[PDB]
Amino acid sequence: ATVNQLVRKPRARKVAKSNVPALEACPQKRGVCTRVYTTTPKKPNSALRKVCRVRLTNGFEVTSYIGGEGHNLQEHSVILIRGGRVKDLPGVRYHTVRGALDCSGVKDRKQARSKYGVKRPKA
Amino acid sequence: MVTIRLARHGAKKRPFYQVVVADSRNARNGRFIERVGFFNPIASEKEEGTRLDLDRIAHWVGQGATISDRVAALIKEVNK
Amino acid sequence: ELQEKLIAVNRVSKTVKGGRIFSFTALTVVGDGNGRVGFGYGKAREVPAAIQKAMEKARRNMINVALNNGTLQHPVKGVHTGSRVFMQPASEGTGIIAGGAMRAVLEVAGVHNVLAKAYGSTNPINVVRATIDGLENMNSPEMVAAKRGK
Amino acid sequence: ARYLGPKLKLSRREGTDLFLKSGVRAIDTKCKIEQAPGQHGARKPRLSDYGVQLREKQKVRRIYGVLERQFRNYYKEAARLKGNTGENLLALLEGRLDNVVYRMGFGATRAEARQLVSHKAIMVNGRVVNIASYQVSPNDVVSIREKAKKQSRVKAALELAEQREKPTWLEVDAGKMEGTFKRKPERSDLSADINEHLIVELYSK
Amino acid sequence: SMQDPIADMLTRIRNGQAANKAAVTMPSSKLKVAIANVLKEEGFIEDFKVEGDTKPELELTLKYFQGKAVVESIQRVSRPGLRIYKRKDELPKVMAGLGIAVVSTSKGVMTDRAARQAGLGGEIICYVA
Amino acid sequence: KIRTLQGRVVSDKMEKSIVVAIERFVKHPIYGKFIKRTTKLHVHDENNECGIGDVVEIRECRPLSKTKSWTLVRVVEKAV
RNA sequence: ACCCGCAGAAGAAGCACCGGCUAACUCCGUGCCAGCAGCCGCGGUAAUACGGAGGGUGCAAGCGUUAAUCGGAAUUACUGGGCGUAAAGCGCACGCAGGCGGUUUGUUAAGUCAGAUGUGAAAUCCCCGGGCUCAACCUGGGAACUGCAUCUGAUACUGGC
RNA sequence: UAGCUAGUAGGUGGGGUAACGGCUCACCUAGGCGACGAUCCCUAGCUGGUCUGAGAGGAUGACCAGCCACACUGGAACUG
């Protein structure tokens, strides 16, 4: 490449583009929720996984994961969505938080006090 | 027209009591022409806690610069 | 206080015929602790034997360095099969620092005050031979000036 | 990091005397002393060629009761002072205010000698002090405020100072509660169960 | 032509160390015999001479000294082409000051050491280290 | 002293003016561009003796219109 | 502010984690079910990876978890550029605009440079002092910024002829 | 996005202005811009300074100063 081929434009830089574009750079996004479904995970492993359908307050509608066990997740309950790639589900990149809005905490919890939507009772 | 003022010249409650040559148009914490010394009564327990430049002062007092009540007792002491 | 140092260990597993076999390779250094460096390759069906073969070669290998006062005077490069190890004299702090396969090599040469990176292949049996090509490449000043007549 | 638990349990984990929970009733008998920690463990772990120095370094750090950034401060100070870095690192920790308050006998433990500094009970050059990061000057006086002289804390610490090996580099009195840091210890003055001169090959980074 | 006689000088010596040859021959020019005296002055060559008038030819006697090789890189700076000038106070240094930059100055072709000691600036043509 | 510029005539189709193409160099040492450029400038001329191809020398003078302030001093080189 | 008293241990400790990388792990339940992950993969009757118990590791008024931009990546290359087949050489070519060429002298002194004179204020990096406990911050004294502009010279060289 | 321009280019002389100029008028001329990116769209206040790294190189113009532009949202003026 001659100096005559490097004229009027600096060398290009690229990629690092969102794999979670429906969040529009926000770390946690608000959405209404309409239905929950059970589906087949990756690998011959006989396990099952849960997913929900969530329209966001910016007009995108995503397929989101449900972690842990048990739910109160229903039509127009309103919940918060984040990123978080799943190795056990094809195309699943969106995840639900229990620590916000109508979403329920996990029952019988003795581990990790800040996770899965739990808060220890106080006076 | 030229004048001389005393300023706190420092951070929150940590003044240095600096004296500057400036113009009558300037603001309380605004512009100034020359920094000429400091007139601090505490000076963090310093023995040379007050000072004035004896060449820069003669360029403006001798010469029409007005001096505030806040530093005149020092300019009188070096007799400039 | 001569010290015999290990760089890395590798395991190579091969299907035969029916079933599998596996051997281990080690890379060690001994040198002299000042102005001389030396390294050995060793391969066996067990790690302690691969290290034992490597030490038996490392004590029978030597390279002389143009070294004075335990330190470098100029930046230097050395190359081997995609490892492009570049060395700079390091001062006013910690002496090691540098790439993980270089730290014992500099110390058995007595020059463990140097910042070095691989700038290519990170494979330790290429990296050590590119670091040693740099210790072979460096010269004294003294000799880079003494090339003048008289 | 805060341990939030028994001082003897911590001292057994580190396998050595830290000058913690000290008192004239002494160590030896009914206190698990010199026993290995937990259900299984060695009285000297076998360790890597860096780990053997790193484990001695964290004993030097805890036996003088300093933070990692403060241990590194004296390492960087000794790395620009004369020969062996480790003997000079120890001569900087041994000359620090909180350990001098311990060697003078005003606290029963190094942790209590340091508590007396944070609690503003100590004086140096006749002047009140609060920061444990201070290097004591040769032939200067260390004392305590008269408002603190009737604490059993100091009576029982000076009672213990009468029941240990005499520090050969200073002088102090329990009726005045006042002592002079004449010099640092030199060569045959000082020893410990842990090593200093071999850990001169650390950091990383 | 031969549209750059300086690349004819530079390659013929760089390729000569790569063949471990005792001397090399090239067509002569006034820059080639100036650069040859700087290379003889810093000890990168042993001697140089010219022979003939109809086709004057330059013979360079090579020097390799103790150990292996006498130079790592011999690099172009000014070109026939884009020419790079510096003042006496703006002269670069090569290889922690153990390498040379070649400068044509106002006086003649010399080292950056000789130039900053003579208080001169000019066109920088080569780096040798 | 005055700044002087030189360039070639590219139009003469004005009652008291000419249009000149002037040559300059650019280093731009924050990108390293190292190029020649040609600027088209409008120039005042009440002698009207320049042909389209002649080379002219110009000076800073007086504003007349957009990009026109410079005036003709002399013809340097006549075409051909 | 700063100093001296008075109550009474009183008013004051969490969060992530324990196969291996990378520091801590044993026994028991579940028995491919159900969960767990940064990547390996774990899980069918001794599960170092799930759940629980008893202990243990890292950090601490915090501890985990995330977002955007730049690094590690020479992986947009000046320093580190590349192009048979991996990846990048126009089907075979002509040629206008752009880029661009040996050697010598005379001439000009634009650029080039040596001496001379300006600028790039204050703060501050860095360097020699002072103040607070470090990191901050404040304060006394410094240093430099290829150039651009002007002037006295030289024309080795580049441009011009 | 490769074409775009009648107040668009040039002459002469008033009227207004500190003052230049289709600012605006009278009577003429037929020119101008274009791959060194014209025409058009999107982003953005500028500088001292600030940020990042092996530097090189990019990025940045919250902070404290020196300027600009602007003040319901648009268009004009006076007074000093």
Swiss-Prot record, chain B:
Alphabetized UniProt keyword annotations: Endonuclease, Hydrolase, Nuclease, Ribonucleoprotein, Ribosomal protein
GO cellular component terms, A-Z: cytoplasm; cytosolic small ribosomal subunit; small ribosomal subunit
Reported induction: Part of the rpsP-rimM-trmD-rplS operon.
InterPro entries: Ribosomal_bS16, Ribosomal_bS16_CS, Ribosomal_bS16_dom_sf
Swiss-Prot/TrEMBL GO biological process terms: cytoplasmic translation; ribosomal small subunit assembly
Keyword Thylakoid found: no
UniProt keyword Nuclease present: yes
An example Gene Ontology molecular-function term: four-way junction DNA binding
Family stated for the protein in its record: Belongs to the bacterial ribosomal protein bS16 family.
Cited function: In addition to being a ribosomal protein, S16 also has a cation-dependent endonuclease activity. In-frame fusions with the ribosome maturation factor rimM suppress mutations in the latter (probably due to increased rimM expression) and are found in translationally active 70S ribosomes.
Assembly and binders: Part of the 30S ribosomal subunit.
Protein name (database record): Small ribosomal subunit protein bS16
Classification of source organism: Bacteria, Pseudomonadati, Pseudomonadota, Gammaproteobacteria, Enterobacterales
Primary gene name: rpsP
Swiss-Prot record, chain D:
Consequence of substituting residue 50 to D: In rpsD101; suppresses a temperature-sensitive mutant of release factor 1, R137P. Not a ram mutation
GO cellular-component term (any): cytoplasm
Pfam families found in the cross-reference section: Ribosomal_S4, S4
CDD domains: S4 (cd00165)
Recorded superkingdom: Bacteria
Xref: InterPro entries: Ribosomal_uS4, Ribosomal_uS4_bac-type, Ribosomal_uS4_CS, Ribosomal_uS4_N, S4_RNA-bd, S4_RNA-bd_sf
Assembly description: Part of the 30S ribosomal subunit. Contacts protein S5. With proteins S3 and S5 encircles the mRNA as it enters the ribosome, which may play a role in mRNA helicase processivity. Some nascent polypeptide chains are able to cross-link to this protein in situ. The rRNA transcription and antitermination complex (rrnTAC) consists of RNAP, NusA, NusB, NusE (rpsJ), NusG, SubB, ribosomal protein S4, DNA and precursor rRNA; S4 is more flexible than other subunits.
Name of the protein in question: Small ribosomal subunit protein uS4
Source species: Escherichia coli (strain K12)
The organism's taxonomic lineage, starting at the top: Bacteria, Pseudomonadati, Pseudomonadota, Gammaproteobacteria, Enterobacterales
Gene that encodes the chain: rpsD
Swiss-Prot record, chain E:
GO-annotated cellular components: cytoplasm; cytosol; cytosolic small ribosomal subunit
Keyword Ribonucleoprotein: yes
Disulfide bonds: none
GO MF term list: rRNA binding; structural constituent of ribosome
TM helices/strands, residue ranges: none
SUPFAM superfamilies in UniProt: Ribosomal protein S8 (SSF56047)
Keyword terms, alphabetized: Repressor, Ribonucleoprotein, Ribosomal protein, RNA-binding, rRNA-binding, Translation regulation
Self-association and partners: Part of the 30S ribosomal subunit. Contacts proteins S5 and S12.
Family indicated by similarity: Belongs to the universal ribosomal protein uS8 family.
NCBIfam families assigned to the protein according to its UniProt record, in alphabetical order: PRK00136.1
Identification of the protein by name: Small ribosomal subunit protein uS8
Biological classification of the source: Bacteria, Pseudomonadati, Pseudomonadota, Gammaproteobacteria, Enterobacterales
Gene name as annotated: rpsH
Swiss-Prot record, chain F:
Keywords: Antibiotic resistance, Ribonucleoprotein, Ribosomal protein, RNA-binding, rRNA-binding
GO biological process: cytoplasmic translation; response to antibiotic; ribosomal small subunit assembly
GO cellular component: cytoplasm; cytosolic small ribosomal subunit
Quaternary state and interactors: Part of the 30S ribosomal subunit.
PANTHER family the UniProt entry points to: 40S RIBOSOMAL PROTEIN S11 FAMILY MEMBER, SMALL RIBOSOMAL SUBUNIT PROTEIN US17M
Physiological role: One of the primary rRNA binding proteins, it binds specifically to the 5'-end of 16S ribosomal RNA. Also plays a role in translational accuracy; neamine-resistant ribosomes show reduced neamine-induced misreading in vitro.
Protein name, UniProt field: Small ribosomal subunit protein uS17
Taxonomic source organism: Escherichia coli (strain K12)
